[PDB]
Structures are given as structure tokens and as C-alpha cells.
From a paper:
The UNC-45 chaperone controls myosin function mediating the folding, assembly, and degradation of the muscle protein. UNC-45, which is present in all eukaryotes, employs a UCS domain to interact with myosin, a central domain that mediates oligomerization, and a TPR domain that interacts with members of the protein quality control (PQC) network. In addition to functioning as a folding factor of the myosin motor, UNC-45 can form linear protein chains that provide regular spaced docking sites for HSP70 and HSP90.
Given the difficulties in obtaining a co-crystal structure with C. elegans UNC-45, we moved to the less complex fungal orthologue SHE4. Despite lacking the TPR-domain, SHE4 contains a functional UCS-domain for myosin binding.
Numbering used by the authors: 1 to 222, 230 to 309, 335 to 665
Amino acid sequence: MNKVWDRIVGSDSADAQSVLKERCSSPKDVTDLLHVIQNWTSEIHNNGEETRCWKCVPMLAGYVKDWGQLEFLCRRILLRSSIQEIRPLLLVTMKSLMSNHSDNTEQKCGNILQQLLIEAEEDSGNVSLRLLVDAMSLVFPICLGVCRDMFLSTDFQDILTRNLNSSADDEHLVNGALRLLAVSCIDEAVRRFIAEHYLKTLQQSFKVEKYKVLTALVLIKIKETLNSCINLFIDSLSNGENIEINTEALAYLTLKPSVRVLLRGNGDVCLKIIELIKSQDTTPTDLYGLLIILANVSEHPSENVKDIEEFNRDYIIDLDLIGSLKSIKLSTSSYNQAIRIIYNVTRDKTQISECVKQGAGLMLLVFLAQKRNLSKDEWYLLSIRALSKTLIYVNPETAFSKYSPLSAAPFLFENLPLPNDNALSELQFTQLDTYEALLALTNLATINQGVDLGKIILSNAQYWDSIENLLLDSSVRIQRSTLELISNLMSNPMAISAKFFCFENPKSAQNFEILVKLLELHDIQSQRAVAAIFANIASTVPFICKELSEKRNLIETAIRVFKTQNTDTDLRIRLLVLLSSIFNANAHAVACVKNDEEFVKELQKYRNTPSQKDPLTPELSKEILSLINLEHH
């Protein structure tokens, strides 16, 4: 099994998983190939051949069950720990060796480390020590036992600390040692050791520019002392240096409020983060970190809120961040963070308009569309929250780059409680969510006098059920908003009017009687909405108006509410429109009330001089008194 290795490490065209079909031969293929590897890994080849080799070895390694065929691999891997380009592949290989016979892998590793220490003690140069600390950092999170034993030993500390002190400008050794310290901070005993014995050294190397970032990354893992780290990450990110390490750090650290206030305080860094997010060059992993930072820093508390709105307006809105984000390629996690950003920005109603102009509504809708049959998780909910807030404060038809705002409606309906015969919604929405959904729906229902939304409601019986199920909600604001929604939907008969005004249908006639009672709701906004339902339909659909004119409970209730509450202007107007439509359609209804003297003198009081923008009050009082006159003469 010789030539297979040559074609495996010969060029990137061939693949190992490819020629895995030519392998097989478990008695011979694995053994023979391992002998080829052993003779071949006896030297260091260029980065391409080595990358092929350590991409391929893990497979074979995972297979071969005879441990004495995988011995040499420990030396081969540890002796390449300084080779950066193939370091993670080595890790993978070691992990594969670790997956089966873990203990023997770690044992051979410890033995090789001890020989490396002896070689390092006899080296007039630092090259053996570099190798040793690179091997230690490479295998530390998998061989934690032997690595902790090495790091903690006086013999290893002696040579390490001494050569560090002596060779402060051996950048490869210092850097290897700082990466070692960071990685090794995983274990607790090592962390205590580092935090008891290295603070002097770390303060020292923190003063040296070319080691500042790596030293800060060690210090993170162990107030003023922290503040200096954060200022380092911020300044070095704003410069442009070590985008990867700094963004990772700050994405973690912006989980703390003080870090956030500092970041928002530093202008240059904010411009830099926005420009990096826009920059077509930064890696997708850095883009993700940048977005995590932006979402953390833009989040409203539940730091001073005004600082957060100032930051969001200055750097996210005015730098057209949302308009750009529409165009960058986003993973699902990055899209999640962008939804977070949009949500945060909309916590300040004054910005929603601008957000929508930059395309945020579109991003919300696409996000929901793609998650619809996929992941109704917390980001789904968050997206619906942002969308509801959007639709409460903007004109709907100019809100999704000329896409249909009505496409939001199915998503809004997911924050309405389903009829309680209808499963559990994956969405953990609250009463506030339901309230805001109904506000947004009420806004959608203004389009084309409610026909568009009503047609969406009629295509799915569930939607109308979830509305009707809020007619008697115990929360005043939900009941109020429901009635406002229904009254907007009653600007066009379509067929939704049958829900209340098809008297041949028992269910509808019952809903009618309920509505008549709702005319006397204590909440004046609810009352206005109920009145507008009746007034809209009666002034707009003459068939229904003829039927309503015969419904004595409605007429008596409307008159009672007019007698006792006519000093509210919207309510008075709507009751007058209802009553006059009814009376014009039915002289026998007029004859019914011709002797209600209190009704007559309330009507006369307004036939005089209504205030405000109110021609209808005198006009309609005049009409009604005229009909009563008709009946008395």
C-alpha cells in the first residue's frame, strides 16, 4: 500500500475519502499504509503534503484497533506542534487517537513531553523549549492529566520562567508561552498557579506592545485590572489589529454592562465595528462576532436608556447599517443577531420609520418565512415582536420595499391565543405580545377598508376564531384592541359581517347579542369601537341596516348610552350615525321612541351647538328630531 500515499499527498485534486475504496484490505491495507506513514512522517514535508496527511490520518486512526500500530503517531504529531498551518488537524488526529485507547495515547504523550523537557534543558537555544510549550498547548484540552503534571512541576517552571525572563525578544517563545498560559487556564489548579505566580510577568509583557493582546487574552481568564484588558481589546479593534481575537473577546465581554458602556463611549471603535460589518472582506466568523457585539450593545435594559438610544440612532441608523445588512451573506446565527439588532432598535418608536426605510421589515418577513416550517424558537418570537412594533408605528403600504405588508398577518396571528381546543403554540408570547399583535392587525385592517385583511381572515377559520375568542377577554386592553380590529374589518361587508349580522345563524345571533351588551363596556375606547362597528355597518350596508332597525335591544341600548354618555364626541357621533341610519330605515322604530322625553331633550341640546370638528352632531340630531316630529304630527 505504497502508491496510495503518494497519490494522497501528491496534490489537492485527489482525495483520501476518495481512495478509501482502494484501501479496504484490513489485514494489509491499514498495516501496510501505517508503515508507509511512519517512514513518511519521519520527515517534515511542505504544508500541502502535510495538510493532506493529517486530514487523512484521523480516518485510518479511528479504524485501526491494534494500538501498537498507532504508537509512532504520538511523536509524529507532537514534533509538529510548532507548525501553525496544520495545528488543528494535528488536534483532530490526536482526538481520533484519543477516541479509542485514550489512556495509552495520553501516556505516550506524557513520556514524549518529558523527553522534550530534557532536550529543552540541554538546549543553548530556545527552539526545544518553543517546541515543548507548543506541544503542551496543542494537547492540553485532551491530555489534561499529563499536561497539568508537566506545567505544575518545578523543573518545567524553572526553565520556562528563566528563559522568558532572559529572552523577552524571542517573539516565538513569548507568544507560544502566552498561548500555552491561556489554553492551560482550562484547569483550575493551573489557573490558580497562573493567578498566583505570573501576575508580575503578565504585567510586564502587558507593557510591551507586540505582546499586549496575547497577554490580555491570558488575563481575561483570571476591576481596574480588568478595565485595562477591555480598553486594550477596544483600542486594538478600533485600530484594525487582531480582528479575530478581539472580536471573540468583546463578543464575550459585552455580556457585562460596564463593558457595554465603555464600548458605547468609544466612538472610533463604533465606527470601526460598523465599517467591519459592512466590509466585504471580514471573515464570516468575525462578522458573527461583530453582530453579537452590536446586538449586545444596542439592547435596551429591562446603563442609561438614553445612551443606548443615542448609540442606536447615531451608529446603527445613521450609518445605514440595516440597509447594508440586507446585502451581506448571513448564516442563521448571524441572521439571529441581526433580528436582535432590529428588535433593539425598534424599542425606540421614533426610529421605526427610518428602520423600515432601510429595509428592516423585509428582513423580518424573510426571516419569518424561512423559519415558518423549521424553527419556531425564541428568535421566531423575537422577530414577531419587532414586526408587531414596526406595524404599530408606520404606514403599512410603504414598509417592505413595496412588498405586501399583509404578508405579516399570518405571523401576527401566531401571537393571538389559539382557541383553547387548538394545541400549544411553540411561541411563549405574553399578554403584551397579544396586545401589540392586535394593534398591528388593527393597523393592517385599515388597508382598503379592511378587505385585504378580511380576505386573509376568511381563508383560515382559525384566524377568525382567535379574534372572536378575545371578544370577552378579561384584560381591558386586549378586549379594546380586538374590538378596534373588528370595527376596522367592518368597513366593508365582504362576508365577515356574517359573523355578527346573519341572524338566521344561531352562533352569529348570539355574537350579535354579546356585541349589543358590549356597547355598555366601562372602557370608553372599547365603547367607541363597539359603537363604530354598529354605525359602520348600518351606514354602509342597507340590507343589514334594515335588519338592525328591528332589533329593539340594540336601539334601547344605543339610546341609553346616548342619554348617559353623550358628552364624549366620538361616541356621540357614532351613536347618532347608528340611530339615524336605523330611524331613516324604519318609521316604526321612530314611533317606538317618540315619547322618550329625556331622549328628545338630549337630542335638542346638541341640535344646538356641538364644539370641535363636529358638523354631524347637529345635523344628525336635527334629522332624528325631524323623524320624531313626523311621528307626532
